[PDB]
Structures are given as C-alpha cells and as structure tokens.
Amino acid sequence: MLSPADKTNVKAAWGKVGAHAGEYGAEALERMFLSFPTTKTYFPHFDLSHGSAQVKGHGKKVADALTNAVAHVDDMPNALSALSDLHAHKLAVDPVNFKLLSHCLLVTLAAHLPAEFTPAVHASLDKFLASVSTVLTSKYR
Amino acid sequence: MLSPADKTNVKAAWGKVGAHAGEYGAEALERMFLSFPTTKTYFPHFDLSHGSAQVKGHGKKVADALTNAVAHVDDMPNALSALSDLHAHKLAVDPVNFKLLSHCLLVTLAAHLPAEFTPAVHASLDKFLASVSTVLTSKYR
Amino acid sequence: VHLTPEEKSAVTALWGKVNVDEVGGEALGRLLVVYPWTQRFFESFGDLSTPDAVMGNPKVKAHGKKVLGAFSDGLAHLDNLKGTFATLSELHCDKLHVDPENFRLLGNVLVCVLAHHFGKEFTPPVQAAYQKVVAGVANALAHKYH
Amino acid sequence: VHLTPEEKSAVTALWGKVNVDEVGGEALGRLLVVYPWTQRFFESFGDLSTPDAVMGNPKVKAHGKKVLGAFSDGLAHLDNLKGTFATLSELHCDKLHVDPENFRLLGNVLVCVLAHHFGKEFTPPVQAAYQKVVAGVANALAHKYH
Ligand code: HEM
Numbered sequence A, B: 001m002l003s004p005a006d007k008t009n010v011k012a013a014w015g016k017v018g019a020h021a022g023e024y025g026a027e028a029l030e031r032m033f034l035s036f037p038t039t040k041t042y043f044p045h046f047d048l049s050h051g052s053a054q055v056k057g058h059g060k061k062v063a064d065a066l067t068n069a070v071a072h073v074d075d076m077p078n079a080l081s082a083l084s085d086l087h088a089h090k091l092a093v094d095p096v097n098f099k100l101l102s103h104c105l106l107v108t109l110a111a112h113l114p115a116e117f118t119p120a121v122h123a124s125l126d127k128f129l130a131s132v133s134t135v136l137t138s139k140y141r
Numbered sequence C, D: 001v002h003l004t005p006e007e008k009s010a011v012t013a014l015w016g017k018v019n020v021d022e023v024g025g026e027a028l029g030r031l032l033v034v035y036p037w038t039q040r041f042f043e044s045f046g047d048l049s050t051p052d053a054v055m056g057n058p059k060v061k062a063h064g065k066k067v068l069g070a071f072s073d074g075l076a077h078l079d080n081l082k083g084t085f086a087t088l089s090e091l092h093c094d095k096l097h098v099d100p101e102n103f104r105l106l107g108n109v110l111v112c113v114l115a116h117h118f119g120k121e122f123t124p125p126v127q128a129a130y131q132k133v134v135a136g137v138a139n140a141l142a143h144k145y146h
C-alpha cells in the first residue's frame, strides 16, 4: 500500500526516465534474459539475440504500461486490468519472474539515473514495482 | 480468491479435522522445523525437540487461528488484522516461509483425512491456505 | 544430495511399497487439478475440463506412471542426479519450454500424494528425506536450462 | 561455482575499481532502507529512524566494510565458497538467527549499488556474472544452517 511520498518519488523518478523508457524497458528485458535464463521460457517465439528488434519493441510496450500504471497510481488494480488476465489467465507467468524483472528495472534505472536513485527513491520504486507485480499476478485463482 | 465451492469444501474439510485441529497444528509445525530447518531461525526461544510442549501449545494457537479464519472465510482481513500486524511487523516473517507452513499443513491433513482429501479439496485447501498467507503478509514494508 | 544413510534408507523402503500406477497417476492428476495452468502443456491429452475428468483420463495416467518411473530412476542415482536427468532437462527447456518453478509444485504434490497414501507411516522424518529427493530432482531438471 | 573464465575475469576486473569502504556502506545502508524489517537485527546501531540517519550512521558504515571484506574474500576463492564462508554461516545461523532469505536481498541490493556506481560499465553480461556470484555467496552462507 503506497504512501503519499512513495508516489511523489515514483512520479519524479519515472519523470526523468522520460522518452528514454522503451530504451530502459528493453535493456531491462535483456538484463533479465542473460541473468535469469529461465525467463526465456515465456518467450519461445522471440528473437532474444543481443540487439533484437523484437525485444526492443517489447521493451517499449512494457515501459509504457508502467508509464500508465504510474499515470493511474491510485487505481492500479483496474488501470492495469487487461494486463492481469494476460499474465495471469492467458500466459500464467509464475510470480518469481515478476520479482526478477522488477529487480532488473531497478538495476537499469539505477544505471541510467545516478542522482535520482537515492535510497528513498530506491525504496519507493521497489514498492511501486511489487505493486504492479502484485496486480498482474492476482487473477491467478 | 475463494469462490463458494472452495469455501464450501474448506468448511467441510475443516469441520472434519474437528477436535483434532490442535493435533494437526503440531504435527505440521513439527514437520516444518524438520523438513525446512531455516524456518527454525524464527523460534530460537523454543525447545523444538520431538513432541515437546512449546510446539504442542504453539500448535493449537495456529490451528485455532485457522479455525477462526474458516469461520470468517468470507472476510479474513478483518478477522486476522491482529495476527497480521504480528507476522508482518513484530516478527516480519518472510512470505516464503508461509508457503512452507502451508505445504506441511496439507501434508498433515492429507495423511489424516484420507477419504476427505480429494483433488478438489486439496485444491481448495490450497487456495485457502494461500489466502490466509497473503493476509498475514500484506504490509511487508 | 547430501543424504544421510538413516535418511537414504527411509526413502527407499517406503518407496518399494509404492504402487506406481496409483501414485504416479494421482500426482500428475492433482497438478493439472490443483494448479490449473499446468494443463496448458498437456493440451494434447484431451478432456481436462473437470477434476473428475482429470483423474480418469488414460493419458494423464500413462504419463504420470512415466514421470514416477524417472523419479524412480533418481532414487538409484541419488549421488548423481545431475547426470541422470540431464537429457530430460534439455527436453523440458528446449522442446517443452516449462518454467522450472513448476517442477517444485509437482514434487510437493508428490509429497502430498504419498502421505495421502500412507498416513502414519509417512512420519515427519520420512517426509524430510523425500523433501530432499524432491528438491534434488527439481534442481537436476533445472540444471541444463540456458 | 559454474563461472566461465570470461565471467571470472569480467567479475574481478570490475571488482578492482570498487571502493570497498564506500560500497560496503551503501549496500547494507540500502538494504536497511528498502527493506526496513531487517533493522530488527541491528538495534545496537543507534538511530535508524530515517534514510539519512541510516546512510550516515557510522556503525552502518563500519559494519558494511566488514560485509564486503567477506565478499572480496569469496571472490578470491570462487571455487570453495561453501568452505570460505563455513564459519560465517554457522554464526548467522546459530548466533544471530537470520533467515537466509535475507542474504538474497543483500546480494541483489548489492548488484543494484554496483550498477549505480559504474553505469553503462555494469553491462548486462557483467551483471550476469555478478548475479551468479551473489547467489553462490548466499548459498554458501545458508549451507551450514541446521
Ligand atoms: C513489470 C511487470 C510487467 C509488465 C508491466 C508487463 C507488461 C507487458 C505488456 C505491456 C505486454 C504486451 C501486451 C500486448 O501485447 O498487448 C506483455 C506481454 C507479455 N509479457 Fe509481460 N509484463 C511484465 C512482466 C512480465 C514477465 C515477468 C513475464 C515473464 C517472464 C512477462 C511475459 C510476457 C510475455 C511472454 C508477453 C507476450 C509476448 C507476445 O506473445 O507478444 N511479462 N507484458
């Protein structure tokens, strides 16, 4: 359950990301594939080669939903609803995988946002992420 | 999330345990300490020897807590708030330990209610234990 | 894996009393039933709409027996599971694409099914040894993921 | 620890630029802010009430150096972690009673801090070596828990 301060941080942090989010969303996906190969199991149909256009374009689609999750900070459960069925109904992605991607956005963000990624902010974005991951995982049963 | 069939099989499964809830709370805790020793880090101030009195006693506090959870199956959060602020902030048990206590609960039930442990009841008890679990780990920071 | 004799003998005996047709079918059955997403890999098996159609499907049973059989092979190479399940691992990642987190569920489900079978005999200490076999198996099948 | 020489060299090379006095501080420091409940292990450290109290707490800064030492020293022994950390695991288990789950957190919080110093220098491939290393360390530390 996010705090008024947590929000403010998530917002000003994602606010620096800016246009460079697809970038980050892709670098994250990639950081996840090399570090946690299990996760490629859900992407049998992708070209996971370093630099692939499929991945890159996907990284924009993830990065966006996040932007959207941000945009609807006080209504994530409903805002991201289509995404819950997909990852929960259709794809049935096991949650440990959400802990992992979240761990990579953090790293990623951390690698592009030096002055932004302060302990306080690192705490909030981690909180925001657990939340997104919580909603996209809920309709499991 | 519990659907009525679940609630219905839980109530029924549980109600059977009946006056043995107590004994199963212990068999289960005992089983968890043994099969998964890391969980023992949470009970240093206990004597965890075979059939010992702290577990016997602590066994009925757990099963009773389940019983109450059953009775309020339709509103577990209100029903557990207390236990929640204790496992989440005073003890702050990492959630993963919950999957273990839950597995062991199912094994003790399974070994004792043979006719009653159907693939539907197994399933329901699992969806149930999963919810008790989630409610006791809702404010982990 | 790091297995004690008093432990390595416990698993064994119990195991010898296992009715493979019955136990193996019920496990694979409770998985499709208790964790519905698994059904997505077994689509060629046929009707798995209801629990009662899961535990009775001849394909589920035949396949469960085969899983148990390999679980059986592992209690013989307990000191070298890596090499035993190497081939099935590839199979499970390259062809079948199953997230190795799923392996744990089957193993746990296996521990529920045995204890459902044996009651008293599947004591807390017998349970702990199988807890080890089952994890060792899961690791062994995850080893060759890349 | 399954670490190719490429991963080997990649790991160390980088570690050589790491300011231990600093990184040690930031890591336990974040661990303690991003995951507040862990503070229940350090009440002897004086004020921990806010993120500044913590990051600046001299006792947090002194202790993290210690953490890293042990790390530096596991990297000098990649092929015998279990042993390298055998005494430390016992302690964390018997004396301090820390759920080994917390080790994974520290490790991952570490990996995050490296990425914050080095930037594009903490390429994906480098991160992968490190992920393998912190995982190895965490298991070594959880190994003698009984
Ligand atoms: C931060 C959490 C995540 C978010 C916000 C997210 C977002 C998305 C989005 C926006 C899509 C595309 C929906 C569309 O195409 O209309 C998607 C699809 C997909 N996601 Fe996620 N995702 C997340 C985590 C994960 C993880 C952990 C996995 C598994 C490792 C995963 C696996 C997939 C797969 C396989 C697809 C579909 C690929 C395809 O068939 O085109 N996602 N996700």
Ligand code: HEM
Pocket (backbone or CB within 6 Å): B039, B042, B043, B061, B062, B065, B066, B083, B086, B087, B091, B093, B097, B098, B101, B132, B133, B136
């Ligand atoms: C379904 C899961 C669980 C339920 C229903 C449950 C219920 C309870 C209850 C009723 C108490 C006694 C509280 C009181 O006296 O007011 C308790 C305490 C406690 N629980 Fe849990 N519990 C569960 C799981 C766990 C888990 C998995 C662990 C960690 C392995 C854990 C660790 C503890 C500890 C250390 C205490 C304090 C005991 C003492 O110091 O006397 N519990 N729990």
Ligand code: HEM
Pocket (backbone or CB within 6 Å): C038, C041, C042, C066, C067, C070, C071, C088, C091, C092, C096, C098, C102, C103, C104, C106, C107, C137, C138, C141
């Ligand atoms: C728990 C350890 C497991 C073992 C030891 C095991 C074993 C096996 C074995 C031996 C085969 C046949 C290999 C052969 O072709 O000779 C097989 C096939 C298969 N297994 Fe696993 N399995 C395990 C867990 C799982 C998991 C959890 C799933 C999915 C959740 C799964 C999915 C499959 C699939 C889709 C096939 C193909 C069957 C066919 O030809 O119709 N396995 N499994």
Ligand code: HEM
Pocket (backbone or CB within 6 Å): D038, D041, D042, D044, D066, D067, D070, D071, D088, D091, D092, D096, D098, D102, D103, D106, D107, D137, D138, D141
């Ligand atoms: C990579 C993981 C870790 C490593 C290498 C590590 C290493 C160390 C080392 C070298 C010491 C000093 C040993 C001694 O005092 O004799 C120590 C002490 C200690 N460690 Fe760890 N540690 C790790 C993770 C953790 C975490 C996750 C916790 C709990 C959150 C923890 C809690 C403690 C505590 C409470 C002390 C004693 C503090 C005091 O009383 O001064 N450690 N650890």
